Amino acid sequence: KLELPSGAGLTADSTPLMYQGLEVGQLTKLDLNPGGKVTGEMTVDPSVVTLLRENTRIELRNPKLSLSDANLSALLTGKTFELVPGDGEPRKEFVVVPGEKALLHEPDVLTLTLTAPESYGIDAGQPLILHGVQVGQVIDRKLTSKGVTFTVAIEPQHRELVKGDSKFVVNSRVDVKVGLDGVEFLGASASEWINGGIRILPGDKGEMKASYPLYANLEKALENSLSDLPTTTVSLSA
Amino acid sequence: LQAPDLGSLNSGSLVYFRKIPVGKVYDYAINPNKQGVVIDVLIERRFTDLVKKGSRFWNVSGVDANVSISGAKVKLESLAALVNGAIAFDSPEESKPAEAEDTFGLYEDLAHSQRGVIIKLELPSGAGLTADSTPLMYQGLEVGQLTKLDLNPGGKVTGEMTVDPSVVTLLRENTRIELRNPKLSLSDANLSALLTGKTFELVPGDGEPRKEFVVVPGEKALLHEPDVLTLTLTAPESYGIDAGQPLILHGVQVGQVIDRKLTSKGVTFTVAIEPQHRELVKGDSKFVVNSRVDVKVGLDGVEFLGASASEWINGGIRILPGDKGEMKASYPLYANLEKALENSLSDLPTTTVSLSA
């Protein structure tokens, strides 16, 4: 049994369950229960039933447009359930989440609520980068009265490497400073600009506190100045 | 049975219930008005209990072959209906058994004989709509079906819809039915959305159950939400702001421009705000154009005003929210951010003190 978000591109007898690229199961039922809750169910191959365990995720994959592998078979099929196994007690019912929320429900995950005074053009699905390589993903963006609150996730392999003390820098905006001695390009590269997202400046040791600030660029993260205008430190009278 | 024409039915064609032959067509004759054909059938003696007052008769005759996307299922089920024709029927659960020459309508297809509630619609235009092919989505699943499409005199397209009886509880006093365009998706490259076309979307509400609705185009759909904040904001120029531009507070889209009307004084916009964000504008605000780029270069002053490049292709209007105010009817639309801070709507600044020389 499956608890689907919405039966948008799903078909009553045509949506398969891939595992290692091979067809394992088949969505055989799709209903709209009252309350606006789409639920369906699936018949899986008995060879694979040993893999369905306590933290085994079934997430639906979108047919993304591939530039390197121009395939018509992926676009002609459409939505596709992907199986990723785990270990533990065998269970026989799962919860399917959309493609953006799929990273939250991994058996290990590091979920951080980071606040900001502005969205800075950071969308819901932006990649999240440490040392040039993507290590996580923004999950969702919620607007509050104080500002913009993000929720990000970190993959389990990289979970050890953030080390509890970190700065979070926006990569969505370009910034050029020109000068006689000061020439620098801040916040992006052009391939990183179309990706966008949040950059981590990792530190040595800390306890992973709940909330973090999102700094506007790299120099405001080094100075630890979240506000737009700098801190008044000493005043003068004249 | 009363049909608009005889169809593929001959005298001696067969009557099915659950694909079991339980009778035959006895005769056929034109009624005294020349519109119809009266087809009278003969159900067998032990099967008389099957026919009820709420039974529906439909026509299953000939072969229909369809070419569909992601596979084209041409399946040949009934062989006896091809040569001579057939009539199937339904038996509802709780109804009195019909008897003694009770009339019935003969539907032309199984899809036309689905039970449900007729829902009248007042459509803007029947542009991409089809008489029996436009569905009503709810949660991505097909709920209803546009079954009729007419052009009433006065240039008023009206149609009507049969919805599934499971969903009829959702159709209430502020329940909107808006038509969705098949937009081009870059992340989800789907052929199914583009091959279908126009699609009615159902979004429910609460209150008194109603059975007729008004469908508005995709741009005007935000105005008719059960809660909405509609603002008429004036401007001396369009500033390249089109009808469908997004409207942005703190980087995230919170509303939408509805329409743009040109008057003798200038350009008057009408914008709308979603109900979740309705509390957050707080009655005092400035409205800044995001459609134009502006670069100021200098030795100390280097700034990029009015846009970012992703925000430039979106464009639209930015809100500068304030603390507290009553939501007055009209607002001004400032040209950029610095003219909104100075509160200077005019192109050249206010003359404050004059001089003579």
DSSP string, chain A: -EE-S--SS--TTT-EEEETTEEEEEEEEEEEETTTEEEEEEEE-TTTTTT--TT-EEEEE-----SSS--HHHHHH--EEEEE---SS--S-EE---TTGGGTTSSS-EEEEEEESS-TT--TT-EEEETTEEEEEEEEEEE-SSSEEEEEEE-TTTTTTSTT-EEEEE-SS-EEE--SS--EEES--HHHHHH--EEEEE-S-----SEEEEESSHHHHHTT--SSSPPP-S----
Both tokens of A113, joined, read 């609520």
Smallest Cβ–Cβ distance between B250 and the set A30, A64, A148 belongs to A148
Backbone Cα Rg of chain A: 22
Asked if A57 and A121 sit in the same domain, the reply is no
B76 and chain A: CB distance < 8 Å anywhere? Answer: no
Distance of alpha carbon B217 from the chain centroid:
8
Do the chains contact at A9 and B138, CB–CB below 8 Å?
Answer: no
Say if residue B286 is in the same domain as residue B334: yes
| Contacting residues for B156 by C-beta, under 8 A, at least 6 apart | B122
Written as one letter, the residue type at B137 is M
- Using an 8 Å CB-CB cutoff, list chain B residues near A38: 139-141
Q: Which pair of tokens denotes residue A53?
A: 């365990």
* Paired strand residues for A176: A185
Q: Structure tokens of B243?
A: 């009808």
Residue B70 belongs to what H/E stretch?
none
Tell me: do B106 and B136 sit in the same domain. Answer: no
| Residue A159 vs residues A130, A135, A136, A156: alpha-carbon distances, Å | 11, 9, 10, 5
**B139 vs A32, A76, A121: nearest CB:** A32
Question: What whole-number distance in Å separates Cα of residue B350 and Cα of residue A70?
Answer: 60
Burial of B24: CB neighbours in 10 Å, binned 0-12, 13-18, 19+: middle
Pick from A107, A130, A153: which residue ends a domain? Answer: A107
In this structure, what are the phi and psi dihedrals at residue B72, rounded to the nearest 5 degrees?
-130, 95
For chain A, the straight-line distance linking the first and the last C-alpha, in angstroms and rounded, comes to 76
Tell whether B310 lies on the interface with A, counting CB pairs under 8 A.
yes
Does a structural domain hold residue B353? no
B231 contacts B273 by C-beta, under 8 angstroms: yes
Q: Which domain holds residue A120?
A: 108-229
Tell me, what DSSP letter sits at residue B112?
G
Q: Are the beta carbons of A215 and A168 closer than 8 angstroms?
A: yes
Indicate the number of domains in chain B.
3
In a domain? residue A234: no
Distance from CA of B61 to the nearest CA of A (A): 27
* Strand B212-214, strand B117-122: pairing: parallel
Chain B positions in Cβ-Cβ contact with residue A143 (cut-off 8 Å): 249-250, 252, 254, 277, 280
Same domain, A2 and A101: yes
Residues A79 and A95 in one domain: yes
The answer to whether residue B355 sits within a structural domain is no
- Is A238 part of a structural domain of the chain? no
Single out the residue of A100, A128, A132 nearest to residue A114, CA to CA: A128
Strand-pair partners of A128: A136, A198
Task: Identify any residues that bridge with B269 across adjacent strands, giving them in sequence order.
Answer: B233, B260
User: Do A135 and A81 share a structural domain?
Assistant: no
* Residue B310 resides in a domain: yes
**Pairwise CA distance, residues B287 & B238, whole Å:** 13
Task: Give me the residue label for tokens 């040392």.
Answer: A131
- The answer to whether residue A42 is domain-embedded is yes
- For residue B81, the surrounding DSSP H or E stretch is helix B80-83
Contact check, Cβ <8 Å, B70/A63: no
Q: What residues of chain A, 80 to 139, have a C-beta less than 8 Å from chain B?
A: 117-122
Q: Which residues of chain A make contact with B138, given a CB cutoff of 8 A? A: 32, 36
Q: CA–CA separation, A155 vs A138, rounded Å?
A: 11
Structure tokens at B157: 């397209």
Q: Are residues A113 and A223 in the same domain?
A: yes
The residue of B171, B199, B310 whose CB has the most chain A CBs within 10 angstroms, and thus the best one to mutate to test that interface, is B310
Residue A126 lies in a domain: yes
Task: Count H helices and E strands in chain B, helices first.
Answer: 4, 23
What's the DSSP call for residue B47?
Answer: T
A87 Cβ contact list (under 8 Å, min separation 6): A53, A54, A55
Resolution in angstroms comes to 3.5
CA distances from A7 to A10, B54, B72, B163, B169 (A): 5, 32, 21, 18, 20
Residue finishing a domain among B185, B200, B226 = B226
Nearest CA in chain B to A14: B70
Are A24 and A131 members of one domain?
A: no
CB-based contact A7 B141, cutoff 8 Å? yes
Q: How far is the alpha carbon of A156 from chain B, nearest alpha carbon, in Å?
A: 26
| Residue B354 covered by a domain | no
Residue whose tokens read 């990183």: A192
**Cβ contact, residue pair B70, A62, below 8 Å:** no
Would you say A204 and A167 are in contact if contact means Cβ atoms under 8 Å apart?
Answer: no
Tally A–B CB contacts below 8 A.
78
Same domain, A182 and A165: yes
B11 and B90 co-located in one domain: yes
> Which of A137, A234, A126, A130 has its CA nearest to residue A173?
A126
Inter-chain CB proximity A121 and B251 less than 8 Å:
yes
Q: Which helix (H) or strand (E) holds B148?
A: strand B141-152
CA B81 to chain centre: 37
B160 and B109 together in one domain: no
Choose the closest CB to B252 out of A9, A32, A148: A148
Burial class (CB in 10 A: 0-12, 13-18, 19+), A68: exposed
Is residue A85 domain-shared with residue A192, that is, in the same domain? no
Among the candidates A107, A124, A150, a domain finishes at A107
| A201 alpha carbon, distance to own chain's centre | 18
Cβ(A82)–Cβ(A127) under 8 Å? no
**A134 bridge partner residues:** A129
B274 reaches A (C-beta below 8 A): no
Distance in angstroms between the alpha carbons of the first and the last residue of chain B: 101
